[PDB]
């Protein structure tokens, strides 16, 4: 079997194994910041830099999945707790879409909210034009930040949040689980063909935008992921 | 909402918060040793010894859970390695069957395979009688040893393996992932419907069985769980 | 180590985690209310379901432990706000005494003031036959609900109360640090040796008693705990 | 009552409620960096601004307090995480002392060990110039770094730690839990006469350092205090 295996407990600039896209910073403890708080429509992301082949042509399998993180959000004074953050998947020449206006994007998508990925949104502000619920959420996107489904969740400021989540090749299965500091945890879960969705090989990573009122501190504290592909 | 977490990264005897059933044994180093290797058809259990609420019959609702935990099977001289452990939910009063052959029943199900339990396998015995497939295997058990789903799976002898489960209550989705010592992962996911197959209180523990010429060391080395119900 | 940890935002009936004896109610809200406002010498206690082992003969070592609660008094018309809560350990076979008179026994004692108990009173009524300070105070009880020692406080109807405490095993110290709706910090500790005082296994809870005329609204709105003992 | 509340979720450079000492940073993220890991014997403190009246000549009253804090401990590539975070209480003309070695000093001491301050220490590394154990350990300092007493503790990288701590006048008791990733509490009190070994008017505060060979990242998230005073 084919597998891609990794672990981040911190990061680092001159570290060739992580893509650094538009305003993405590394704090001096480790952590990665994705938007910058003095910028109008800031959009940063970040990429493992191998591409995982997610797929075989030859043989039509399909790999299965194993990923953690863990990030944080924080409210800066004044401005609108805002965009979120986005955990996605995309072609392996992916890269912040061109003229980005940000916010509501999480900088994955055009205006009208379309784009070439699969993620899991954290996402902390309702925008109408993409459909959102009313309230802070975790959403499933296909192509588009107008979610495939959503769950109420609750993005709290200052706190460590930690993800997990596994893709069922068999199955389809895209399953994630939120541990929140209160103790409870969220999950949602959706049928997502990768194989039908996505490249032979695509590029893991996460994404965070703000607007001209809407910005907040966005981190990403540590990942793990495991891939495996069945090569028989 | 309504949470229940613990960790467990060793676990004692007089530890009020595991029950012990049949041949459990706790090890000077912490670990839970599920069977006994000088008894024919051992049969060994622990349990969180509280009753978890899984589901509510006033609200509807139903709980989501994410459990982590890490076993290591070891063969012995001579007998033959089985026949694996089983991860179960159960009603709050079980207890190992009566009259139990352990073997291929995996200590949660009568001599024909049915029992009243959930239960995520990880079998190292091909019983006929219970159609198990040829090799190694993690199944998908529901009021039976005969899974209503197992994926290929290979029980290395002296290796740690983790797992991570993943209850999803509106899918109704119980999705497993399990990391091997050569660092691949194997995943299975089924929908399950804990509320039609459970009673509303239930426990959640470990059972390995081995028979007359099959038996090996089953030890349980950690176990962490957070389940969440909503409560409106 | 063996840890005994869970956090309580709300309640809930039914819920396996907690045990209710004599007069409880949940309330819509998730507030926990110890006594029941139209009946004579009512008598309400809660406990953490699991029994916590608090020390252990093989070994000798006693357990350290943190915990945090949030409570709310509230008078009623015509009645004489009476008696207050009590955040008490006890053996895990605890039961409200036979024949209480609730009122100034706070549940927990006897006619004469005696009990098997250690615990942390928030006492709202004078009574002469128990030694009670004139004023409102928070008390250290040790198998009595006349004080081993108390501070002078001031119980505000309708005011949410933050407590917080502190058992040193090493030290054998009790520390309790109050903060009042005004702002101000109220603090008492006292030694005391619980492997000498109490069993090996114990039970964590709350009681509240009124009397015919001394009722009031006894109110546990929240409750984190985190205990652990050195094991071999 | 005289009575000292505050709390800090966040912190800014800018803010005069602080006083900022050495090496000390505050991140975009509003966590307070206290040592620079490019600067050989780095010491960095952080300060309450505003003096705190701890007693009184005129009455001889001692103040009460409760005060939580998290805080960050993170290894660095090719570095000893070292030396470790301690809270501290200190004259209100408290500096870094001249010439500091940093090091095992944690920024409050000479090079033999000794100053004017009374502490609690996450020391990370173990100094034998200054008797300490051979793990990782909290400790209660009085004038020197030499501890009065120590507890084994572990510093996990990456970890946000939570700390509370009460000081009863009455008792004199400085009691301490520290609330570890792995679900563990740890517990530290010693009787310490603030009054005997303090001027009237302290500064509160935080204070971290590094060496040649020792570095690592020390962090302060957030911050609440609560002081009281008996004024008549
Ligand atoms: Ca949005
Ligand atoms: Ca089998
Ligand atoms: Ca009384
Ligand atoms: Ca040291
Ligand atoms: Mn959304
Ligand atoms: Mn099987
Ligand atoms: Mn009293
Ligand atoms: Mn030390």
Do not use: C
Not at 62 to 85: N, Q, R, W
């Amino acid at each position: 079997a084919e597998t891609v295996s990794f672990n981040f407990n911190s990061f680092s600039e001159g570290n060739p194994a992580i893509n650094f896209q538009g305003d993405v910073t590394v704090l001096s403890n480790g952590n990665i910041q994705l938007t910058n708080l003095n910028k109008v429509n800031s959009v940063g992301r970040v990429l493992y830099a191998m591409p995982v082949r997610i797929w075989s042509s030859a043989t039509g399998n399909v790999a299965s999945f194993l990923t953690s993180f863990s990030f944080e959000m924080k409210d800066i004074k004044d401005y609108d707790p805002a965009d979120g953050i986005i955990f996605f998947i995309a072609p392996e020449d992916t890269q912040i879409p061109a003229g980005s206006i940000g916010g509501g994007t999480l900088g994955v998508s055009d205006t009208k909210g379309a784009g070439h990925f699969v993620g899991v949104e954290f996402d902390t502000y309702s925008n109408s034009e993409y459909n959102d619920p009313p309230t802070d959420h975790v959403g499933i996107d296909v192509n588009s930040v107008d979610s495939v489904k959503t769950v109420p969740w609750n993005s709290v400021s200052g706190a460590v949040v930690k993800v997990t989540v596994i893709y069922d090749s068999s199955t389809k299965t895209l399953s994630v689980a939120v541990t929140n500091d209160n103790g409870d945890i969220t999950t949602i879960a959706q049928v997502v063909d990768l194989k039908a969705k996505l490249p032979e090989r695509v590029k893991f990573g996460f994404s965070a935008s703000g607007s001209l009122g809407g910005r907040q501190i966005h981190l990403i504290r540590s990942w793990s992921f495991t891939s495996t592909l069945i090569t028989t």
